[PDB]
Structures are given as C-alpha cells and as structure tokens.
Design a protein around this ligand. Structure first.
Ligand SMILES: *[C@@H](CO)[C@@H](O)[C@H](O)[C@H](O)[C@H](O)COP(=O)(O)O
Ligand SMILES: *[C@H](CO)[C@@H](O)[C@H](O)[C@H](O)[C@H](O)COP(=O)(O)O
Ligand SMILES: [Cl-]
Lengths: 320, 317
C-alpha cells in the first residue's frame, strides 16, 4: 500500500530535478539538481519574478565599478546560486549547480567558474559540502573535475551518453556521474520515427545506465551513478536500486500516486574486482566518435544549455 | 578556338581528379589527383585491378613471413594505398594525395607515424616525397600532426574541412593544402530544411563555405592552397571557377568536358590575427552542428571502408 516513490527511496537516493524549489518539499527528495535550462524555466515563472529582480538590484548595487559585461556575468552566477540556496532550504542533502556551458572545452576556465560558484555559496553562508558543481563530460570537463576533486570540490559530471565516457569520469575520482536516459531514448525513437516508447528491455537509455552501473560495480568505482533525464515512470522503475536517480516533479508526482509493489532491479555484488588500464585522451576521443549518438547528444546538450544561458543573459540585460 | 568548360576551368584553377582509378585520369589531364579510403576500396574491388591487388598480397606475404595476421593485413593495406598512388603518378605531372588510416584521427603521434610510413613506402618504390600529399582528417589532433609533418618537409592535405575555424587553424599550422567539402555541406542544408531541389548557388552552404575560406586566406596572406572537394553537380564546380584548385570526380569531369558555354570566373585575388587556441577551436566546432556531425561521420565512414579493405585482404590471404 506504500507509494512507489516511498519504496524507491529505500533502495535508491531520490533526487528532484528542478529549479522550482516550491515543488520540492512535497516529494522530500534527498538531493536536488538544476541545469541552465531548469534555471531559465524558473526565472521565467511569475512567482520568482521578485527573486530575480532582487538579485539583479543587489548585485548591481554591490558592484558599481564592474563594467556592464562583468556585471551581467556576476548577476547570472548569483541567480544560479540564489535558486540553489532556496533549494537547500527545503532539503537535507546537496544541490547541483552547473558551470557556464560556454567553458565546456576549457579545463582552466571550468575550474575558475566552479570555484566562483563555491565562493558565492560560501559568501551566502552555505558550506561547500552541500553543493555539487555540474560539468559537461567532455574530455576537458573531466580533466577539470579531476583537479577540483583533488582540491575537495565535489563534481557532478553530466551529459554522459557513453560507457567509455563514464569510465573516464570514475578514473578522475569524480563524486557523481549523471548518465542520461531520456535523451538516448529520444535519439532511438527519432531514428525510425517511433511514436511509442520502446519496451523497457529495448530502451537504449535504460540499457545505457544499466551498462554503466554494471561497469562501476565490477571495477569497484566509488563514483555515484545517478540516472538522469526521464520520459516516463517505467524508465525510473526499471532502474530501481541504482545509487541515485534524479527525477522531474511531474514524474515524482506519478510515483507518489502509484501504490504498486516495487522490485529492485540494480544490485551491488561481492564479485572479484576488475582492475583495468586508464582511458587515455586519444582512446576517449576515438570511442566517443564511434558512438554517433553520444557525440551528437553531448555536442547538442552543450549547444542547448548555451542557448538558455544566453537567453538568461538577455533577460538580465533587459532588466538591468 | 572554342573551348569546353573543363578546358576553360583549367586556365583559372588547378583541376584535380578525385579517383583511385588511374585508367580514367589521363583522359582528363588533371594536374594533381586525390584518393581516400573509400576511393581506394572501390578501386581494389574492380576486376581490372584484381590482378594488381593479388600481386601486392603475395609480394608482402613473401617478405613478411613471421608477422601476425594483424600486422600482415595492415602492411598489405599500406602497400595497396601506395601502389594505386604510384600508378596515378605515372599519368599526371603533379602530386597524388594518400590518406592515413582514419583510426588514428585523434592521435597526433600515430598520425605522424602513419604519414612517415606512407612516405617511406613511396621512397622504397622510387618516389620522392615531393610528389605526395598526406591526407589527414582536420581534427585538432590531425592539424597538430600536420604542423610537425610540414616542419619535416612532408606536405599535407587537410581533409574533412567543414568550418572556417578548421581552415584557419590549418593555415596557421602552415599546411600545404586544405580540402573544404562542398557536397556534404549542401547535403546537410537540404536535409535540415527538407529541401526538394538544390539551393540557389548564392545560397548554397557548401559553395559559400569555400568562398568564405578562400576570402579569409587571401585577405590574411595565407599560402595554404584552397581545394574544393566533394561535389553533387557541375553547377557547384562552375560556381567556384578561379579557386586555387578543385578536385572533381570522373563523372563530373566528363560533364565539364562536354559543356561548351563561356565560363565566368567567380573567385579572384584583390590582416593578421592571433592564432586560434585548442579551446577556441573546439568551441567553434561545437557551435557548428553540421561541422561536428560531418567531421565525425566522415571519420566513421572512412574507418568502415578501411575495415572492409582489411576484410577483403584477410579472405584473400
Ligand atoms: C542534471 C544531471 O544531474 C540534470 O538537471 C540534467 O541536466 C537533466 O536531468 C536533463 O537535462 C534532463 O533532460 P531532458 O531532455 O529534459 O530529460
Ligand atoms: C580528398 C580531398 O582532397 C577527396 O578524395 C575526398 O575524400 C572526396 O572528395 C570526398 O570524400 C567525396 O565525398 P562525397 O560525399 O562522395 O562527395
Ligand atoms: Cl554530431
């Protein structure tokens, strides 16, 4: 008689995927995740209009010497952080905040942006252990995360569409990876103009996370596997037992209202640990190129997040 | 004397034949010729070259008795590539382009190794490096490899060029020649807009890519040769009359040979910025959805054809 959501929480760390903090409390997730598209969506909700306006005025008044370009950048990071803090107010776990997608191919500036995010959280009275820095899993992002982790800054490597990509992240000692499910299912359906979701056993997105989970547990990697991007509740249910799953409020609502028994599908084991050679940059780039879907979706994800980041900047400029 | 469009084109652009079939080249009298893994595969499968392929298989196997099936197959493949190149050099005054194994496209060190191996095979057959261009996919790693190869006196043909950023980086690396694709860019344009007919020449993304690269190069004083490649029809070739060079399929060369109207020259001659960084190159390439897709798929396609050649070799060993 227990909801599927409540049962899921006992075998998987449930995470809410949204910037709309007022919707989080009723699902009581452990952690929460944001991204540039979710922040933009929240910024355009009338209920957060004053939060945005206040942030713009505060940063503007506190930084009278910054040139207009730098001012807009500061406001954008403060908005990202402001939503993150409102989220932390209603959860006991961590919040993921993503670096500017425009630095995705530059490890040095990714590190800079990551530290700036942490600095803003700290200036606002939040300890860094409550925050995960979200970084696109390009070779450069992974390289950046490797350095950040060495300095005690936990990262969430996102836009993961390939197993070799996930392996490189684990080898860099990243705290958590977000292999995508839904966007892979999108590719699969679009390839043949499919009108209905594939059967779970045939869902490329679900199988991607299953393969990454199996890889991690067989290699003793401690990086947390967090499935992200979902199109339907069956995809979430098929991954019950995964370390974590970040889920939209719409799907959390469906899970909360279903009371069927939930069977765990992903489980850890005590098998002999496999030790393997490290993935070099050249091998990573080759393997990614061989995966047509992965190369396309990683590139597209960066382009789309960039578009939403630029839209936010334009909103800031139009209200400065 | 009235001259065909092909003959008129030769006076304002270096005409290059895009084929592995040397028997078709002499007829059109191009200056240079270009091959690629797909063209070599098609040539290897022809019956007229079945005798040529067979001899190479036996020749290599006799001189390499202890090499495993893996190394033997790869050695036969490189000698086959060079054999077709040498037969092409017999019927032209200029250079031939031979492409490195597409599988090393993201490894500068092994790209350099393969390039040097090709040059060494030509030299052992009495062909000096001046007659050869090494084709390399224009990934960041390929460009870095070409930069070093050029310093060693090995001329490179940077291929699978779909964006101005690649072209800029190639020119900055001192590469001998770049091959911007025209046809594949237009393919993208037509799929994206669900076009039924080809776009007007003025709006043809492929043609405009070469025009832009040509303009960039001449305005900045880059000496890298601009060679348009991959064409869907003769109108696209004609639209680039005046370009440094154009590499054209035998089918389109035949069409040009039979066209008799006046040819209007479209490209003519008439600034220096800091060199593009790896990070800026990667960003610009990512912003160009078409370029990222076509470069990636181009490498995948050439790889498939390289693997097929190995399969033909293994079952005929
Ligand atoms: C961060 C991953 O931990 C998370 O916000 C992701 O960015 C989202 O889960 C995906 O972007 C969702 O994508 P979709 O295509 O909307 O399903
Ligand atoms: C080398 C470029 O100098 C040349 O052989 C190229 O590989 C070909 O021109 C293109 O690959 C042909 O592409 P298409 O899509 O067949 O037109
Ligand atoms: Cl792509």
């Amino acid at each position: 008689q227990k909801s599927v959501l409540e049962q899921l929480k006992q075998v998987t760390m449930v995470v809410a995927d949204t910037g709309d903090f007022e919707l989080i409390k009723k699902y009581k997730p452990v952690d929460a995740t944001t991204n540039p598209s979710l922040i933009l969506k929240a910024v355009k909700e009338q209920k957060y209009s004053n939060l945005v306006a206040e942030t713009i005025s505060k940063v503007k008044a506190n930084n009278p010497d910054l040139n207009s370009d730098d001012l807009v950048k500061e406001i954008a990071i403060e908005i990202l952080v402001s939503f993150g803090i409102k989220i932390l107010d209603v959860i006991e776990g961590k919040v993921s905040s993503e670096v500017d997608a425009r630095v995705s191919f530059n490890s040095a500036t990714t590190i800079d942006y990551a530290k700036r995010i942490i600095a803003r959280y700290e200036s606002n009275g939040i300890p860094k252990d409550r925050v995960l820095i979200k970084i696109a899993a390009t070779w450069e992002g992974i390289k950046a995360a490797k350095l950040l982790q060495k300095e005690g800054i936990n990262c969430n490597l996102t836009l993961i569409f390939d197993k070799a990509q996930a392996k490189a992240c684990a080898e860099a000692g990243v705290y958590l990876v977000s292999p995508f499910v839904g966007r892979i299912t999108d590719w699969q359906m679009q390839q043949n103009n499919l009108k209905t979701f594939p059967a779970i056993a045939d869902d490329d997105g679900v199988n991607s996370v299953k393969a990454i989970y199996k890889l991690y547990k067989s290699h003793g990697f401690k990086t947390i596997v967090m499935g992200a991007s979902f199109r339907n509740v069956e995809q979430v249910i098929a991954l019950a037992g995964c370390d974590a799953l970040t889920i939209s409020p719409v799907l959390l609502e469906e899970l909360k209202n279903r009371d069927e028994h939930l069977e765990v599908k992903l489980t850890k084991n005590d098998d002999v640990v496999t030790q393997s050679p490290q993935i070099s940059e050249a091998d990573f780039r080759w393997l990614m190129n061989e995966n047509a879907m992965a190369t396309h979706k990683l590139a597209e994800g960066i382009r789309l997040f960039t578009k939403d980041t630029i839209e936010l900047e334009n909103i800031i400029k139009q209200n400065l």
